Amino acid sequence: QINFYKDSYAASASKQDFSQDPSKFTEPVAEALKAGAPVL
Amino acid sequence: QINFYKDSYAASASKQDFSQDPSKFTEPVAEALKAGAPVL
């Protein structure tokens, strides 16, 4: 981001964000299923 | 190298590297041959 203009939305592509939370789609279960154990 | 762009591969020609190891092509022998001696 360099953003030569006054408005902040006029900037270039946003700085890279590598945060990943696949659980919300891969383990969306209230009771966490422990790995290596019978998950029933 | 100035690299005005985000990606590092978009930079100009790489900084000069003058390291030279001609031995790997000129003396590729396990037993080093000493100069000025019978090399057999």
Place this chain on the structure above:
Amino acid sequence: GVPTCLLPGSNQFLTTDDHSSAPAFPDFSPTPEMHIPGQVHSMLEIVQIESMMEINNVNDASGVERLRVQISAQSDMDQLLFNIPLDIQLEGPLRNTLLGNISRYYTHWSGSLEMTFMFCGSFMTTGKLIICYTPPGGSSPTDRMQAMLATHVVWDFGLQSSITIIIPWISGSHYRMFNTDAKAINANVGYVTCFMQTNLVAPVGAADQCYIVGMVAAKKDFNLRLMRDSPDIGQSAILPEQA
């Protein structure tokens, strides 16, 4: 003025450039962000979700029959049940999957995959299967004699109704291509086969013929590069407001 020379590449429009642009609405105030569940940060989060695949992709099954697989009580032993090609680029069971659809936007892929098979019989139906991934190089195994030698997992039905087989990353190169030549070295992934291990046994009161549902996804070590226009959807003219 400042000394200046226009380099090659000036006055060009590159669709992948990253530059700031003049704001059309000065001092505009956007709507404040509101927390919405299910925010996606990377495409790799969606290829890790389960997705059923069309194993029964034959010219006899219409619709949902193609997402489910015949499983029979056998009068013989060591018989092959079904095959799964691993050609995501070409027309196969793995294309219409989250993993497949998303990775078909890209050209290079890497990493191990996983397949989950769920048994959908009756509670009294018992059975044993063997699922084998075979690395490429030769023909598809037809007998369990040759299939057991490659990677395999023995699945026994019980309280846990689904099994998972990991297709590991066995490749000389770092990445593989979604090439139209699925028969090439850079594109071929391997073979998947299912063999009956002992038999499928069901009582008289239970339905004799059961089904397997197959699903495929990626693991944490999955990577994609060189994203491209997918051949999934096409266009012949600008879409109108009519039929």
Place this chain on the structure above:
Amino acid sequence: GVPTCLLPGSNQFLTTDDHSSAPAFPDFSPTPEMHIPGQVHSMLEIVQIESMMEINNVNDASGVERLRVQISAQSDMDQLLFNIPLDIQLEGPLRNTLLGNISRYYTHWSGSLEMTFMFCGSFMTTGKLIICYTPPGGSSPTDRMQAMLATHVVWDFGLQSSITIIIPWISGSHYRMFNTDAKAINANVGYVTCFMQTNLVAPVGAADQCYIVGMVAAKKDFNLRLMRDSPDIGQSAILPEQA
């Protein structure tokens, strides 16, 4: 805006410019480097390797005979064996060499060279040769009387089957040109001659006629400038996918 004036040289495409360019694939992740043996950092590392040369470049030798030289048991003394021109630019023995092929990409060269001659006779074959480098200015020496006065090395066959003669950098100018006029001062390097010193002596059981293999390379003080399109390979049309 910033005051600006476009200088001459703007909107031009120079094939030797050094500027950054817009990346076509944003945030692309290249394959990590893997250690590969034999990494080359400079062109000067390859001109220092030995390379055989076509001394027998006559219209009687076909193929490998041109990389090897007749050597005879003489019935006379002080006779000249063979000559070597040092015109890398023009058609000579030194062109089809690593040193020659690489330096023919450049226009100016400097530094001393080395020639290694290997004797390929029988173990019982003995002999004495004299190899003379003559600086330019006059005609090629024909008798050992005049050849001994220039730079020379006396080679005696034995356990060490190869000899090395250094052609030193004897030039008024710092560099020399690969000029099509090999007869000019800036291009001429000198002459190489081989004379029998005493004789070639072999027993009755051994083959009377032996061979020398000649090789040329550069030393640590070799330099090249003004690289150019080589006249080694040509083209008359775009290369097709056919014959």
Place this chain on the structure above:
Amino acid sequence: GVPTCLLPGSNQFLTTDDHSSAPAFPDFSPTPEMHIPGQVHSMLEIVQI
């Protein structure tokens, strides 16, 4: 000279741009401001009447 590439959007006239421009009257001295009642700073002050 300075390396330079003209991006898309060059040589364009956007009616909502915010850039400085060449002054046509150099060193011009404007009339000093005089206090005038009823100065408006925002359009939101008038919609409240």
Place this chain on the structure above:
Amino acid sequence: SDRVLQLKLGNSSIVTQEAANICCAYGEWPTYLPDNEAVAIDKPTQPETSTDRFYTLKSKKWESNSTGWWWKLPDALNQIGMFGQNVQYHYLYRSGFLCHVQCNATKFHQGTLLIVAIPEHQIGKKGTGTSASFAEVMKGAEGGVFEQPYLLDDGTSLACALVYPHQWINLRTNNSATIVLPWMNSAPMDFALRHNNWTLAVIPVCPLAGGTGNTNTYVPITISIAPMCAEYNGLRNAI
């Protein structure tokens, strides 16, 4: 922790025995609208026990050739009880939904149901350019029937329907499914009579079947939906 589960909301209490787990949509639990995200300035009404309770919808029979059923929320509950009354008397609404699907079969029966909660599910009809009518889309608690469960009636694929929050009712090990859904809108509130946030779809992936003594078994499928954290704004007359 076990396969047993009890969901007790208000006066309602559902006990399930052959369950799997509770699926929270996108790993979130419905909550009341905070001040920093609120838009309407009058106080919303928050009737906890009268609205946040289980409403049981009318059951469907599972047939061998059943294609699937779908219920659009909050349309299914817009005509029922205090939730429906507060929807009718108010303009704006906001609530999550806890959906529980019942399907009882013997251990000799086989069959698999996919219960998928699709957000913002636009139904696309096939072989026509005309958009779906009000009658076809807004069906209330009586529900809808899938023309093409293979395509989810969207032009999409049932195979890729696992991005959405989902449960499987597999007769070997399950008889009930539970999915918890938070608020799904780009706005804090909306209008209930004209927009649906969620679509609960039950699609039989594997047909119901039995062997030689269990064919043609009348097996119903029941839907119980519980609003959670329901707020209503814009009090007015009923419409």
Place this chain on the structure above:
Amino acid sequence: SDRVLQLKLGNSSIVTQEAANICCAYGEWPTYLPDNEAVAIDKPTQPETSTDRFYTLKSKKWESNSTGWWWKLPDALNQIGMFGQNVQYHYLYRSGFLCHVQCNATKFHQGTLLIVAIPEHQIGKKGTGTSASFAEVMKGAEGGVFEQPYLLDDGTSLACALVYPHQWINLRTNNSATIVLPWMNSAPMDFALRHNNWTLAVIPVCPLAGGTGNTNTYVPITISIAPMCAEYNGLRNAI
């Protein structure tokens, strides 16, 4: 240090007496694949003694008009012993090669052999636009014969063939040659039945000859190749 040498790998042991030295390709010694450069995730098999040993190939007679011979690795060893068996049962492979060339002649004989290890050696046939067939390229341990040793069957020059690792067998002072080759690929592993990393070429620079009692001497040339640091990945059935 002397002209004598002993190479002892596994059960094999080669002793040579009129040797010169050991040529390590590009000044490197073959090693096992490290973790930071590994790609395949399953463990590779590393049978040390059963595969890392000298395999002796079938000999060629050195004639006065001999043009030269070439062996492509690992094709020459793909049909032999545990190395061949592990190649057949595995998809991916990685190994260096120690090549030893034997050529025995009397002190009255003359002749010079250039033993050059060319990496990634693409054979180019002459007077035709058709690429070389599978039969012509993949020749196994039985080897190949140079059409144009002057051009290395590549369109290149034999004169400039000294960039590649190389040995000279000069009958005055040598009878054996030894070249050590590490892994040569842009990838950590490859497929053996479809690609060759190295080509060992023996080209007679100076013809074999003798005087008046040593003409027509039957002088064979022997090749012994030893895999080193062999790894195999992707276990499956034989092909």
Place this chain on the structure above:
Amino acid sequence: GEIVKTVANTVESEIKAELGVIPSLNAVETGATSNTEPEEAIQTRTVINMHGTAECLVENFLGRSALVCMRSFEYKNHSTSTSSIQKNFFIWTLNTRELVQIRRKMELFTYLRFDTEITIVPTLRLFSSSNVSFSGLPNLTLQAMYVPTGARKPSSQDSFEWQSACNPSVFFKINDPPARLTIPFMSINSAYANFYDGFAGFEKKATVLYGINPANTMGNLCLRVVNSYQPVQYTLTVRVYMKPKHIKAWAPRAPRTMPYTNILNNNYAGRSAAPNAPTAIVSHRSTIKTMPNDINL
């Protein structure tokens, strides 16, 4: 939520024969993706991956300039006996569903919030008349003005709604670099909705079309040739490319499989035969036991 610069590494494993531990067995009925790791499912080694994941981000997945509009119109004398209308202009009725690739990548997610960079590329041609001679293309001036919802729509080239006193407009030439500007996130809601399961009006009539979002009234784009008509007829083709930036995506969708038929709804007719047929998305193979791409030796 954890930071993932590179994909996960692999650790070495040994023989595993333990009672009560079944990593390979999973219960997908719970709705949770199988967690069976490759490390203890099979026999693995230590692998360290430097493979970056930046290109797999939604930032790079969507932030890539894609065509969203292409209008071609005649630039000539449209006057007649009594017309008084030049009509050397076009309106677009701003939307992002006319091009199938960009539309599909929009509809891979339920909600999208981004500020869009817009590029306009004009091209000229001469109409091939009975007697036409070409030796050059004029450097015409073009005005592209965004008309928001409820504002006046220009009715002709010479109309006076082109003043652009408040409406943002951009003036650019044919020979100049293509015009470029930025639209901020301009939805009345917190995000753009690719799907709207409902109606945009309070009405119960058939006039209110299902699926229309009462937040997608993006406005209009009015593009005009500023220069008056020429003695000879031309044709102008304007291509508008849209590039999202500052993107957040919510609730990923099921990918679209069938060809789009219109922009008002997501109806589909299906293709005649597989692939992507009504009953057959994936093409047929011989049987479930045949391999269509078998490597035969």
Place this chain on the structure above:
Amino acid sequence: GEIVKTVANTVESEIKAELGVIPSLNAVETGATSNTEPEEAIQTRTVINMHGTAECLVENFLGRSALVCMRSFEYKNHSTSTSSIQKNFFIWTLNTRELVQIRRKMELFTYLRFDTEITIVPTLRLFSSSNVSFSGLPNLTLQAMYVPTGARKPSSQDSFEWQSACNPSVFFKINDPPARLTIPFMSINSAYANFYDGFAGFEKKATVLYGINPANTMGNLCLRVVNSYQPVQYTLTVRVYMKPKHIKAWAPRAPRTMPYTNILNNNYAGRSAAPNAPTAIVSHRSTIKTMPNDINL
């Protein structure tokens, strides 16, 4: 490995007559290049060299813009009674072997790793018809789009694969400076291979050509005239220049001596007579004792 800013210096020497020291004698049978230094081979003085070696680096040897493509096509009306295809475009089947000089400098090394800067220079002409009049060249818009492996190939100028929603494309004019961009190192392996001693497919058929690398499937370059056809016929010639950067080279090759005949393999036919003949790379001289360029006084 030592840093070499300038070539080696020379030190002064004296008379050398010692037993057991033979610097001039070497054993090239060991495969080692002769190490006989000039200082003690002959009688030398002290020379200090300031000669730089920067231009002899591989960075400067290869990092120099070279032509790799030149396509010329007709820009006109290609429509017929029933064609419906404009075909004002070309595909390249991306490769770097069509030009012999750049090909030879590629094949001086076994392995090359570099990021390449690509420059596209277009040129226009009018076709000389029976009745053609020229007084200017139009400033046409050209779109060059890279289509990776397995992606769709456009079939016409008016085709809809030119959306470039994901495929990177560059738009440029004739009168603008030549287009320029950068391709990163895009091989699936760690380096590009100029030679591949093997087959790219698992097959044993004759269809799999020897020498094809299953890593050289570089993709395609689809270049189109964005402007529609003109009333009169033109011809467009596009030249694509390739410039390596960030170069590492491995395992130097033997230089190519014979003319190339095609791009699929390195077969050769040889020239009729020396030089570079099948049996005669270097031209003949009279005898081994004659000097072809003798300086006679």
